[PDB]
RNA sequence: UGUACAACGGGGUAUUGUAAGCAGUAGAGUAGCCUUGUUGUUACGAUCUGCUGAGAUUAAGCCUUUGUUGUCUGAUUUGU
RNA sequence: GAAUGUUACCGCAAUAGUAAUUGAACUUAGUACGAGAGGAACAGUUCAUUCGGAUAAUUGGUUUUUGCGGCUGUCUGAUCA
RNA sequence: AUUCAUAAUAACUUUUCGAAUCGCAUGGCCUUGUGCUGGCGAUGGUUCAUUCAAAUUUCUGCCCUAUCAACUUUCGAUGGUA
RNA sequence: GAAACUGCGAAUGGCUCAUUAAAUCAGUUAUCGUUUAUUUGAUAGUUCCUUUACUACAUGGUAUAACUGUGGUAAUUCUAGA
C-alpha cells in the first residue's frame, strides 16, 4: 500500500551537476559530446521578463 | 514491578531480593546476594570473576547474539527531477548521445563568427 | 513516540506520530542501521522495511 | 507382598567458582644446538587460554523417581 | 506413670491463669473561645512507643555441610591426591 | 676557529616537492585546424638568504634580616659516558 | 551580491602587578647550539614505473556545506535523519 506522503509524491533534486566529467556520466554521453549545451537550466520569471542561468562548468 | 539487575554478576533481581547500596557519590548498586555484595565489598573486579555476565561478554562466551551485518550493493533506481531538467525531456536528451555530429555543425558556425569578429575587430582598430 | 520516515528513492519524507505502546516495543533493544519489518508496528506499514538512522531523546 | 519400605543409582534444585589430563604460532625471559639461518628447533619457565558456568558436593531434618538390589510372622502382656 | 474391665478415637469443661499499652502527624480548624495575643476538643485516617505470642519468604548473623576454592609450613621421591 | 658551505659514491623513506589554480589583454605564424605560438599580473610551492621575531645564553650589577651559619645530595644535588 | 565552504587573522592590542630577591630586569655578548607564518630577493627541463598500449594530460575522482524538506527538546552561537 502507497503511502500518503512518501510514494504519492516525489520531489525534484534541487540542484543539478557543476562538473563537466560529473555531467558526462550523468547523461552517459562521451569524451567529446561538448557538455556546455546539455546543461541544466531553471527559468525564473522575476517580472513578466523571464531567464534561465544557467551555471557554470568548471575543469 | 521492576526486575532490576545485578551491578556485579548481571543476574536479575526479583522484589524482595538482596540488597542495595547507596555510595558516598550517590551511586546506586544493587546486588542479588551476599556473594556479590561481598565481593564488591572485597573490591574484586567482576571481568575477573568466571561466573559474571561481563566476563563472558569480555570472554566470548555464549557470544551467538549478534553476528554480523552486509555491504550495500545496488543502484540508485531514481533519475529524480532535478528542478529544472523536466525529467522527461532529460531522458530524452540523454538518448541524444548518438547524431552528435550537429555538435560539429554548431562549432563550424561559431569559428565563422569567431573569425568574423577577429576580422571586424581587427579592422575596427585600424 | 514519532517516525520520521523518509523514502530516498522519491527523495519525500513525513512524520507519523505513534502510541499503541505493545507496536513500538519492536524498536527496542535495537541499535542504527538496523533493519526493521513494519507490520508488527503497524499494518499500515505491511510489507515494508525500514532502517534506522538516527533519533532524539526527550530533552 | 504393594501409587509398601529401605539402600544405591539417575534427574531437579542449590553451593562453589571453571576440575584432572591433553594441547597451544600465549608467555617476563634464559641456556644450548646446528642445516648456520631467515617463526630454526630443543630444554627450563610463575602464569594465561581452550576442551570447561566446568569438576566436586548436594541430605545427613531438600524435592522427585516407570531404574537395580533386597526386606516384610521376633518377644511379652492384657478380659466386663 | 500404677490402679478405675482392656484398648483406641472424638470430645465436654470444674478449677486456675490472662494482656495489651501509650503517643505523634493529617483532618476536624487557624474553626469554636477571646479585644487581641493566642488557641482547643469528639468522631475519622495513617503511623509510631512499650509489652507479648508466633514465624524464618526476604535481609542480616552464625558455619564441623570441615561443602567449594585459595594460602602458609612440613611429611608422603616429583605429579595427581 | 669547524666534521662549515658545497660537491661526489653507496643505498634507505611507511615517500616530500616538482602548478589538473584564477583574472585582464587578446595579439603573431601558417600546411584555416577551434592548429601552433604568445603578453601583463594574482595565488600557491621546495630550498637558501633576508626580515619580523622567539628560545636559550656570557659578564657585572638588587632592599631588610645572623633572635637564619651552615646548605645541596633520600627520589638530581656537582660532574662524566652513552 | 546575503549565506556557507576555503584561506588568513584571532598568539597583536588593551588591563593589572598577585607571583617573583641572581629570579625578572639593565647594559653587554653568543647561537661553530636551533625554530621562524609573513614580507624581500633568488631557486626544480630529470616524476609515463617491465617506465613498446600500463594512461585523461585540450586534464582524473569522491564527498559535503550553504540550499530544499521532515523533526526533536523549556532552554544555549544545541542539533539528527533524508
Ligand atoms: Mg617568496
Redesign the interface.
Known sequence: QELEGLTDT???????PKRANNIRKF????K???VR??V????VTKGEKTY?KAPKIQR | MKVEIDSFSGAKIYPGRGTLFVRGDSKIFRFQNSKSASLFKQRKNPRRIAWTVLFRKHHKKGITEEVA?KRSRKT???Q??????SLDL?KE??SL?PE?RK?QR??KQKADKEKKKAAKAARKAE | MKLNISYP???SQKTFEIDDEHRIRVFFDKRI?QEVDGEAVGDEFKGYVFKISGGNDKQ
Open positions: 516525489t520531489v525534484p533534486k534541487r540542484l543539478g547523461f552517459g554521453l562521451s567529446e559530446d561538448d549545451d546539455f541544466i537550466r531553471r527559468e534561465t | 551485518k540508485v533506481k531514481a529524480r527531477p532535478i528542478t529544472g531538467a532529460i536528451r540523454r548521445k552528435v555538435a554548431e562549432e | 528513492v522519491n527523495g542501521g
